[PDB]
Structure formats: structure tokens, C-alpha cells
Design an enzyme around this catalytic site. Structure first.
Site, PDB file in Angstrom:
ATOM      1  CG  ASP A   1      -1.893  -1.174   1.391  1.00 15.68           C
ATOM      2  OD1 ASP A   1      -2.499  -1.063   0.312  1.00 15.68           O
ATOM      3  OD2 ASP A   1      -1.837  -1.737   2.307  1.00 15.68           O
TER       4      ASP A   1
ATOM      5  CG  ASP B   1      -6.716  -4.478  -0.342  1.00 17.81           C
ATOM      6  OD1 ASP B   1      -7.643  -4.928   0.097  1.00 17.81           O
ATOM      7  OD2 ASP B   1      -6.194  -3.528   0.364  1.00 17.81           O
TER       8      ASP B   1
ATOM      9  CG  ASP C   1      -1.579  -6.372   3.360  1.00 19.35           C
ATOM     10  OD1 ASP C   1      -2.086  -7.036   2.272  1.00 19.35           O
ATOM     11  OD2 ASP C   1      -2.244  -5.718   4.190  1.00 19.35           O
TER      12      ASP C   1
ATOM     13  CG  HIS D   1      -6.516   0.322  -2.194  1.00 16.83           C
ATOM     14  ND1 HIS D   1      -5.541   0.164  -3.021  1.00 16.83           N
ATOM     15  CD2 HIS D   1      -6.449  -0.530  -1.065  1.00 16.83           C
ATOM     16  CE1 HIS D   1      -4.671  -0.900  -2.644  1.00 16.83           C
ATOM     17  NE2 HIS D   1      -5.127  -1.013  -1.254  1.00 16.83           N
TER      18      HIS D   1
HETATM   19  O1  LIG Z   1      -6.288  -8.274   3.353  1.00 11.62           O
HETATM   20  C1  LIG Z   1      -5.897  -8.324   4.598  1.00 11.62           C
HETATM   21  C2  LIG Z   1      -4.756  -7.176   5.237  1.00 11.62           C
HETATM   22  N1  LIG Z   1      -5.156  -6.134   4.170  1.00 11.62           N
HETATM   23  C3  LIG Z   1      -5.753  -5.006   4.494  1.00 11.62           C
HETATM   24  C4  LIG Z   1      -6.031  -4.256   3.316  1.00 11.62           C
HETATM   25  N2  LIG Z   1      -7.156  -3.317   2.840  1.00 11.62           N
HETATM   26  C5  LIG Z   1      -6.939  -1.975   3.589  1.00 11.62           C
HETATM   27  C6  LIG Z   1      -5.255  -1.852   2.968  1.00 11.62           C
HETATM   28  O2  LIG Z   1      -5.297  -1.126   1.700  1.00 11.62           O
HETATM   29  C7  LIG Z   1      -4.897  -3.152   3.286  1.00 11.62           C
HETATM   30  O3  LIG Z   1      -3.808  -3.491   2.217  1.00 11.62           O
HETATM   31  C8  LIG Z   1      -4.635  -6.751   6.688  1.00 11.62           C
HETATM   32  C9  LIG Z   1      -3.539  -6.357   6.968  1.00 11.62           C
HETATM   33  C10 LIG Z   1      -3.561  -5.812   8.331  1.00 11.62           C
HETATM   34  C11 LIG Z   1      -4.526  -5.809   9.323  1.00 11.62           C
HETATM   35  C12 LIG Z   1      -5.757  -6.231   8.923  1.00 11.62           C
HETATM   36  C13 LIG Z   1      -5.957  -6.696   7.411  1.00 11.62           C
HETATM   37 ZN   LIG Z   2      -4.347  -2.308   0.245  1.00 10.00          ZN
END
Ligand SMILES: OC[C@@H](NC[C@H]1NC[C@H](O)[C@@H]1O)c1ccccc1
Ligand SMILES: [Zn+2]
Ligand SMILES: *[C@@H]1O[C@H](CO)[C@@H](O)[C@H](O)[C@H]1NC(C)=O
Length: 1015
Positions: A62, A174, A311, A441
């Protein structure tokens, strides 16, 4: 040209129809919680029909979320990329895909030449493959299509220049829900395939049951199918390893080798991964291949995609090894055991798609056609992700302001070639990259941590300053006699004046034009019109005297109106919200007429008394217990009165009636016509006291909204010949209705203050017999029909309102256009509602780790268009699209791409000219030059300028409106030597155009052209 109104496309899956039929039951499906126990026929695969499995390693990075872009780069991404380079170089069969070019470019420019060469080699040999190739993986709900294209072009232009590759497969694992604007843009940018993941769990189940997870996604109005793009929707709850190997996460988690302990990760299903050895490889392979064969049952070919990542994965060298070595042992065993009838290997996304299409061509599968969108997403139970349609609205509005500034800066500076010393390319690249980064996002969505939102805001401010610099240098060059022009590229010849950003009441940052007999008699101002048609529009400036008149540069008088500068204050002494008028600054308003993609100059001159061509607005303060409101030299005394209903009409436009609380009550279109009930109301949603809490992502209201208690608010009425308004100080909102002779403009200064666990909504109540139907737009590109479903909870009926929404019946339509993306709905027949801000104390368990308590004042802007539509040629009842009328489209353009205003900084402008662009073609109203960008620097012998042309589709309602000129963008600059049609990113030439003429596009089409000049 295809008819986008009268031909209902025949598709296998039409999402609105699917939604009307679906039950959306949330039952426990077993280990696949939101599915069912998948069964397969072991004899399906054999020696002559093997299952080909591609395991695709990936790392979701991200560009800001819990940390800023630079913090993640330093702490994680630079190591992921450096170790990917080393591990891929050393292990020829290992593969890796990469999506976010902002991070890749940040990394690559810090590499030494030796490593740049090694990197180019693993890309050229196919081990490292870029997917999508945009600067970011953008949000698809709030983003404007123009900025989705901007960020895609920024990433792909970088990739072509430095890696010599252009991705044709997109990866969007995502974004919180998905929009058909993506395949629209991607298919016009050379793509052949795309992948999505976050769609409602009920949709995944329904499509999986029919093996409709891979489909040809076409636009809702596309009868022929030429917009179709092959799309793969992943089937499970997440893109993480536990939800990508097959239906049972307890089993799949055992194949995420980073979860055995030393990395601080574990499996929540309580069975850990185990190192593959010769004594357990047969049993481990049996478990894994069984998961693969179950996942393969959901698709039509014998080619299976298995993403392997999460991630910020593939950071540590030990992690690369642990995943690679274990999977290599599984592959060697599985591929050598004929009984499995599987051939598995690491692969890339393009490899997967190529094999799927080879299967399709071999006649082994035919794919369904689909149209529609994938909003509003819910990942489980009633947890619908409609909160982020509104979260951090200040930055959502800032996105649209910068969108326009980037377009205007690129267009204004495109007319000339600039010396490197002017730093034009440098400032434009900075601006494009900061706006592109915000499309992430967790950027525009308002789902990042507080300090990350601050970083995005700082970056966007720097981008706005870069745009201003480029714009004002360009205006000075375009309007100064050539033999006099003497630029200092660091100097401010003009400052931009923006009336709606940050906005009155948000930041007192507008400069007053200071005139005086003993200092400066007059001042030149210049307006720019980025749209390709002549435009007249009222413009306003702050001036230090009310005795000012306006002239054009031929010295022709221009009618003007002067009004006071009113500011609202929450008086802590009287506990009221009321207006204070300036006794030193005043607003002058006048109509500016500006050429298509051009400039027009005006002069403001002070006099000792009321000018002949300047009128003064009257002002009426309605409140009991008033106190005086002195206005310095303003020539008309403020009037006072007890609250009462009032009616206003500007020009021959509509007559609007307001309640004694200052809110619209009715609109009368013409002298004879009825007073149509149209009532504005502010309400509030709360948060649940038990169960799941609303947060930055989720909207989980504790029931329907309750009216905001208004008390007896202070109402201010300003009535002028050119512009009138009704403003009222409500709790948390200074609400303003402005009238300039056509559709009113609404401005809300929203300050939710310390109201915890509150979402403020603005609702419109009408009589319109809309039933359960309403329309909302997708990325400012198209309007889609929505149907309110009472079988779904309130939050599921909220949709993104990126630029507008409307309701209609057989005779009447009400359209609300927005200057910022917000969430909204129509929860009852005749209503429209749009969320203004939300302040939430709790985290909503999606990883952000904080509530939303960093609200700040924001000025939201809108246009409200009530129209008769019984004479309009509209789509049939079964068509999934809707279309704006000419007036609503123009109102949207007035919000998104207003005239730009420049104030000359010095006392005298020598060599000033009155106009630029008077000879530019004034194109048909439905056509826009969305992008004008010079693509070459000054040292290029052959200059090239790119244009993106977009034609929308407006309803035919019997309003002739004709006589317009053909716009040929290839002849806008002189000495054209070649004109080519290109992909939307300008990276591939698709057609050499005869006569060097760029033809106009069809309704709902977008084309790109590049003109070459020998000059
Ligand atoms: O897909 C699960 C993991 N990703 C959550 C994703 N969505 C919001 C951000 O863009 C992020 O990349 C996640 C990581 C850490 C804590 C909770 C969940
Ligand atoms: Zn993300
Ligand atoms: C870029 O890729 C093309 C693919 O056809 C290749 O022909 C060309 O040589 C490459 N350019 C270089 C040398 O980077």
C-alpha cells in the site's frame, strides 16, 4: 456509432437483475464459510487432461495506509524489492508480480547501474512481471475516471521508458468493491485481461455456483460488446494465502510457510504449516492438490490461478527461501506422481491468462458476458463498506480541486515548448504524481491513519502550488506581446483566486485586490476556460472598495454586482451562529466570457462613487433579537426582520421558496408552473451500542437517521441582480443556496466539531414517484440504475456518489451534482440523500486501528437541477443505464471544471493582450478535451501533443441547440505533420490518420490522439 440509449444489451449476467433475484442469505457453508462443500469427480483429470496450476507470488504494497509512503518504502518495500531482485536473479524458475509503480520507480532510481541492468534482465526474461502498471492500485468508488487514467498513464509511461514493457493484464486485489470504469479505461489502453477480488460474498457464491467467475465484462450500454474485457473474479474471502489455495483456510494456511513461528505469524485455525520433507511430501501434496481441485471446480478451464502472497510479503531473505524451497518440493512430488494428473509451477499473471485463452481457443470453454458493477461490497454478514464513500471528506473535495488544476496546468502550458530552465515538466510531473498517489485505495477513500492523511494533504498542497506556478507562467506568456515578454521563471506574475477552495470559512486565504486613489487605480484579471466551448460564467473577486467597475480589454463596460463579504461565526458569548460582514473588503461579481480552451482579460477600476455599471445587493438578516451589521463603505444598509418564509428569483430563472429556517421548500421553474415541493433537511445517523461499530470503512447505522434539531437559526438573504443567496447557520453546517439565474448552487460549510459517533446527512424530500429506483454515477463517467432493496440493510443501499445522482418519474427529474465524492442513496420514493461528514470513535476491524476523529471544516459544493423529462427520449425500463440532460451535465462541468481566475500581481502589465483562443473551435456540448498534454521536451525536433477526447451522452429532450464547429485536435497547434490515434495512455499508435484530422468520437466513447509538429 452504437446507440447507447435504445438498445438493451443482451448479457448472461446483468448485475442489477442478479441483485433483484438473489436472496443474500448468510449461511454457514462449512470450511468455506460463505460457500458450500465443494465436490469434484477425481476422474475429471487424467493423463490426457491435466490440471495446470500457476502459483503466482505477490506482495501487496500500500502506497500509504498505517505508515506513509516513505515510511513503508524505508521499512519494507525497499527490502522486498532488493531481495526480489536477488532471489529472482539466483532462482530462474521463481516468479513474482508487481503492481504499484510509485514504489517501483522510487526504488529503481536509487539503484546503481549494475542492479538496474540486473533488474531489466529479470523483467525481460519474464520472472518479474508488472501487473496493471499504474502508479497505484486505485480506489474504484470515489476516484474520477480522469484521475484513474492519470495514474495509469503515470505508471505505464515510467514502465515503458525504463523497463520497456506495457502490462496488458490488470491486478486489483484490494479496492473495496469494483467499477466497470476500470475495464472501460483498461480496454482502451491495450489491456486484454483483468482480475478483481473484493466483491460481495453473496455474489462470489452465486457466480461460483454457475461458474461465472470469469466473464467478458462489457459496459452497461454496450449492445455489440466491443468494450468487453476478460475478467477473473477470485472466489474467496481474501487474497491472503489461507484464502487463495482452495476453499478451506485451515488447510491453506498450512501452505503459508511464513507462519511457523520465527516470523511472528501463526495460523488462526490452529494447525501450523510444516516444513515439506520426503516423509510428509506425499501427505502434504494430497491435502494441497485436493484444495486446488476443489477451487478448479469453480472455473471452466483446466488452468488454475493460485496467488501466493499477502501484505508486504517477500521481505526477508529467509522468507523468500522458506516459501520457494517448500513449494519446489511440493511441485517436484506432485508433478512426478501421475495419479494427481497435475502440472504445477510458479507463474505470472499473464502466463495464467495466456493459458486460459489457449484452453478457450482449444474449444474447452466459452465464457459468459456480464455488465454492471460490484458495489456495495460486504466482506461478511451485514458489514457493508459504504462508510469510505464519505470518510475524510476534506481530502475527497481536495482531490477534485487538484484534478482540475492538473488538467488546467497541463493544458495551459501545452501551447508552448518551454526551456528547461522554466521547470515546467518538473512541476507538472510532481503534480501528476502526488494526485496519482492519492488515488490509492487508502488515499481518497479516507481509510489511512491520521498522519498518513496529513502526508497526502501536504503532497497535494505542493501539487496545487506547482500547478499554480505553471498556470500563471503560461498565462503571462500567452497574453503578453512576444517582443516584450521577459520571463523570470521563479516570479509570480499572477496569483490564482479560488472562491471555493479551501473555501470561505475554511481558510481566509483569498487575496483582496487593493485599489485606491493614492496607490493603484486598477487591476487586470484573467480567466481561463479549460473546456472546448465558449463559456460565460459569473466570477467574483475580493476588492478593497465597493466602488469598482469592470471593463473588458476593449474598454467595453461589463455589468457587475457588488456584495458584502460575509463570514459566519459560532459566537461563544451568545451561543448562536451568525454572520459578520467585512467593513474593508467587498465582493465584485460579473460575467466573464472566455474562448474555448482560452483566456479573457478584464480590468477592475476604482472610482470615488457608485459606478454606472455596478449594482449593489440588498441584505436581509432574519433573526429575533438582531444587532447592527455595519459594512464600511457598502452603499446599502442591512435590513432586519423576524424569521419568515421567503421567495427569490434571479433573472428569468427558477423561483425558489425557503422555510423560515432558511432551507429550500419548493422550486417553480417558470412564471406559470407549479411550486414543486423540494425540501432540504439535515439529519444524523448514529452508531450501534452493541455489535459491530461503524469506522472509516464500514457504515453500520443504529437505524434510520433522526432530524438535526435546528433551534431558531439565523438566516441571511442577499439579493442582487446577478446573484442572490440564502445562507443559514445550522448546527455543524452553514448551508447556502445560491442563485445565478439557472440551477441553484448549494454550498455546505461542514464542521462536525466534536460530535462523536455521528454522521451528518443532507436529504432532499420530493413528491417524485421514483419508487425504489435512483441513479448514481461511476467515476464521473456514466450513470448506473440502482434499485433500493429492502431485503438488504440500510448501509447496503448506500452507493458512491462520485459526481451526481438523480431520481425521476414519468414527468419530473431531480438531479444533485457534486463537487466531491460522497456516499448517498434514495431510501424512500421521492428522496435523495448524501452524507456530508462522519466522526467515529471506534475502529471497524479492517486494520486501520483508529476511528475517524480528525475531521476538519470542509466546503462541499453542489448543483440542484429540477427538470421536466416527459418529453425526453429515455432508455427503456429494462436498460441498466441513465443519462443526464444538457443542463445537468453543464452544471456538473461548472462544479468540476470552473473558469480559473488569475490576478495580475504587479502594478502594471506591459504588453498585455485581451484574449487567447478566440479562433479555437467551439465544440458540441457533449464533447470534452479531458486531457491536453505536450509529450515532448524542447530539445525534440518533432514536438508531440496528446489529447484525450471524451464524448458523454445527453438525453434528447427537444432542445435544438445546434450550430457548432467540428473540433479537430490535431490542428489546434500549427505545422502539424502527423496525427495518430493512440491508446489512452499515449503509449501505442493505433491508427495513422488521413489528412492529419482527428475525428470526433461517438457518445460514451473516449479516444486519444497525438499530433506531431515540425514547427
Ligand atoms: O487483506 C488483509 C490485510 N489487508 C487489508 C488491506 N485493506 C486496507 C489496506 O489497503 C490493506 O492493504 C490486513 C492487514 C493488516 C490488518 C488487517 C488486514
Ligand atoms: Zn491495500
Ligand atoms: C523493447 O522491447 C521490444 C519488443 O519488441 C524490443 O524489440 C526492443 O529491442 C526493446 N528495446 C530495448 C533494447 O530496450
Amino acid at each position: 456509432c452504437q446507440d447507447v440509449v435504445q438498445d438493451v444489451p443482451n448479457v448472461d449476467v446483468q448485475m442489477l437483475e442478479l441483485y433483484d433475484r438473489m436472496s443474500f442469505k448468510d449461511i454457514d457453508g462449512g470450511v468455506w464459510k460463505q460457500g458450500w462443500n465443494i465436490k469434484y469427480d477425481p476422474l475429471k483429470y487424467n493423463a490426457h487432461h491435466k490440471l495446470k496450476v500457476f502459483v503466482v507470488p505477490h506482495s501487496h504494497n500500500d502506497p500509504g495506509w498505517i505508515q506513509t509512503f516513505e515510511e513503508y518504502y524505508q521499512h519494507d518495500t525497499k527490502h522486498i524489492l532488493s531481495n526480489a531482485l536477488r532471489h529472482l536473479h539466483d532462482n530462474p524458475e521463481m516468479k513474482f508480480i508487481w503492481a504499484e509503480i510509485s514504489y517501483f520507480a522510487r526504488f529503481y532510481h536509487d539503484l546503481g547501474e549494475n542492479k538496474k541492468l540486473q533488474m531489466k534482465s529479470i523483467v525481460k526474461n519474464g520472472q518479474l512481471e508488472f501487473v496493471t502498471g499504474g502508479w497505484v492500485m486505485p480506489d474504484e468508488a470515489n476516484s474520477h475516471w480522469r484521475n484513474v487514467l492519470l495514474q495509469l498513464t503515470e505508471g505505464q509511461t515510467w514502465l515503458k521508458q525504463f523497463m520497456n514493457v506495457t502490462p496488458t493484464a490488470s491486478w486489483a486485489i484490494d479496492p473495496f468493491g469494483h467499477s466497470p470504469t476500470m475495464p472501460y479505461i483498461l480496454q482502451k489502453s491495450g489491456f486484454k485481461n483483468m482480475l478483481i477480488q473484493r466483491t460481495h460474498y453473496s455474489v462470489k457464491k452465486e457466480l461460483a455456483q454457475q461458474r461465472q467467475l470469469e466473464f467478458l465484462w462489457r459496459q452497461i450500454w454496450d449492445n455489440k460488446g466491443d468494450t468487453a474485457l476478460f475478467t477473473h473474479m477470485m472466489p474467496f474471502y481474501s487474497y491472503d494465502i489461507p484464502h487463495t489455495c482452495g476453499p478451506d483456510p485451515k488447510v491453506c494456511c498450512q501452505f503459508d510457510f511464513k507462519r511457523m513461528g520465527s516470523f511472528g505469524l501463526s495460523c488462526p485455525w490452529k494447525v501450523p504449516p510444516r516444513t515439506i520433507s520426503d516423509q510428509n511430501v506425499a501427505a502434504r501434496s494430497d491435502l494441497l492438490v485436493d484444495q486446488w481441485k476443489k477451487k478448479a471446480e469453480l472455473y471452466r478451464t483446466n488452468v488454475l490461478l493460485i496467488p501466493l502472497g499477502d501484505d508486504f510479503r517477500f521481505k526477508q531473505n529467509t522468507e523468500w527461501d522458506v516459501q520457494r524451497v517448500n513449494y519446489e518440493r511440493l511441485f517436484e512430488h506432485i508433478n512426478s506422481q501421475a495419479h494427481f494428473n497435475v502440472q504445477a509451477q510458479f507463474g505470472t499473471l499473464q502466463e495464467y491468462f495466456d493459458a486460459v485463452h489457449q484452453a478457450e481457443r482449444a474449444g474447452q470453454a466459452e465464457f459468459p458476458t456480464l455488465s454492471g458493477d460490484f458495489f456495495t461490497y460486504a466482506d461478511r454478514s451485514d458489514n457493508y463498506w459504504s462508510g469510505y464513500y464519505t470518510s475524510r471528506p476534506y481530502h475527497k473535495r481536495m482531490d477534485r480541486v487538484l484534478m482540475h488544476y492538473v488538467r488546467a496546468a497541463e493544458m495551459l502550458s501545452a501551447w508552448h515548448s518551454w526551456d528547461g530552465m522554466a521547470r515546467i515538466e518538473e512541476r507538472l510531473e510532481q503534480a501528476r504524481r502526488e494526485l496519482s498517489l492519492f488515488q490509492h485505495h487508502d488515499g481518497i477513500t479516507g481509510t489511512a491513519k491520521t498522519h498518513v492523511v496529513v502526508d497526502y494533504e501536504q503532497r497535494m498542497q505542493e501539487a496545487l502550488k506547482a500547478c499554480q506556478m505553471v498556470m500563471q507562467q503560461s498565462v503571462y506568456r500567452l497574453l503578453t506581446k512576444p517582443s516584450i515578454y521577459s520571463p523570470d521563471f521563479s516570479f509570480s506574475y499572477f496569483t490564482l483566486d479560488d472562491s471555493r477552495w479551501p473555501g470561505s470559512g475554511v481558510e481566509d486565504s483569498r487575496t483582496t485586490i487593493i485599489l485606491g486613489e493614492d496607490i493603484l487605480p486598477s487591476k487586470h484579471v484573467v480567466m481561463h476556460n479549460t473546456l472546448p466551448h465558449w463559456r460565460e460564467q459569473l466570477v467574483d473577486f475580493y476588492v478593497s472598495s465597493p466602488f469598482v467597475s469592470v471593463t473588458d480589454l476593449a474598454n467595453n463596460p461589463v455589468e457587475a454586482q457588488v456584495s458584502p463579504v460575509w463570514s459566519w461565526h459560532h459566537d461563544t458569548l451568545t451561543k448562536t451562529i451568525h454572520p459578520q460582514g467585512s467593513t474593508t473588503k467587498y465582493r465584485i461579481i460579473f460575467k466573464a466570457r472566455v474562448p474555448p480552451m482560452g483566456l479573457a482579460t478584464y480590468v477592475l477600476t476604482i472610482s470615488d462613487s457608485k459606478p454606472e455599471h455596478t449594482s449593489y445587493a440588498s441584505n436581509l438578516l432574519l433573526r429575533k433579537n438582531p444587532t447592527s451589521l455595519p459594512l464600511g463603505q457598502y452603499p446599502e444598509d442591512v435590513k432586519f426582520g423576524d424569521p419568515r418564509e421567503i421567495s427569490l428569483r434571479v433573472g428569468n430563472g427558477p423561483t425558489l421558496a425557503f422555510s423560515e429556517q432558511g432551507l429550500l421548500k419548493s422550486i417553480q421553474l417558470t412564471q406559470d408552473s407549479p411550486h414543486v415541493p423540494v425540501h432540504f433537511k439535515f439529519l444524523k445517523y448514529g452508531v450501534r451500542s452493541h455489535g459491530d461499530r461503524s469506522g472509516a470503512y464500514l457504515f453500520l447505522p443504529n437505524g434510520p437517521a433522526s432530524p438535526v434539531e435546528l433551534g431558531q437559526p439565523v438566516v441571511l438573504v442577499t439579493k442582487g441582480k446577478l446573484e442572490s443567496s440564502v445562507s443559514v447557520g445550522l448546527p455543524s453546517v452553514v448551508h447556502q443556496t445560491i442563485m445565478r439565474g439557472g440551477a441553484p448552487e448549494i454550498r455546505n460549510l461542514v464542521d462536525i466539531g466534536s460530535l462523536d459517533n455521528t454522521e451528518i446527512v443532507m436529504r432532499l424530500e420530493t413528491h417524485i414517484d421514483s419508487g425504489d429506483i435512483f441513479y448514481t454515477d461511476l467515476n464521473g463517467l456514466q450513470f448506473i440504475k440502482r434499485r433500493r432493496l429492502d431485503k438488504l440493510p440500510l448501509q447496503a443501499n448506500y452507493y458512491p456518489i462520485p459526481s451526481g445522482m438523480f431520481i425521476e418519474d414519468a414527468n419530473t427529474r431531480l438531479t444533485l451534482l457534486t463537487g466531491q465524492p460522497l456516499g448517498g442513496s434514495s431510501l424512500a420514493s421521492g428522496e435523495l440523500e448524501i452524507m456530508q461528514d462522519r466522526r467515529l470513535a471506534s475502529d471497524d476491524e479492517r486494520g486501520l486501528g483508529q476511528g475517524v476523529l480528525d475531521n476538519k471544516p470542509v466546503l462541499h459544493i453542489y448543483r440542484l437541477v429540477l427538470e421536466k423529462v416527459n418529453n425526453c427520449v429515455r432508455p427503456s425500463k429494462l436498460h441498466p443505464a441513465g443519462y443526464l440532460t444538457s443542463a445537468a451535465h453543464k452544471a456538473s462541468q461548472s462544479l468540476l471544471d470552473p473558469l480559473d481566475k488569475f490576478i495580475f500581481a504587479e502594478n502594471e502589465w506591459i504588453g498585455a493582450q485581451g484574449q487567447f483562443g478566440g479562433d479555437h473551435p467551439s465544440a458540441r456540448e457533449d464533447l470534452d478535451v479531458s486531457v491536453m498534454r505536450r509529450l515532448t521536451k524542447s530539445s525534440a525536433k518533432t514536438q508531440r501533443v496528446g489529447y484525450v477526447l471524451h464524448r458523454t451522452n445527453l438525453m434528447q429532450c427537444g432542445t435544438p441547440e445546434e450550430h457548432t464547429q467540428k473540433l479537430d485536435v490535431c490542428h489546434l497547434l500549427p505545422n502539424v505533420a502527423r496525427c495518430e490515434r493512440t491508446t489512452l495512455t499515449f503509449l501505442q499508435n493505433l491508427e495513422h490518420l488521413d489528412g492529419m484530422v482527428a475525428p470526433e468520437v461517438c457518445p460514451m466513447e473516449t479516444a486519444a490522439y497525438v499530433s506531431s509538429h515540425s514547427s
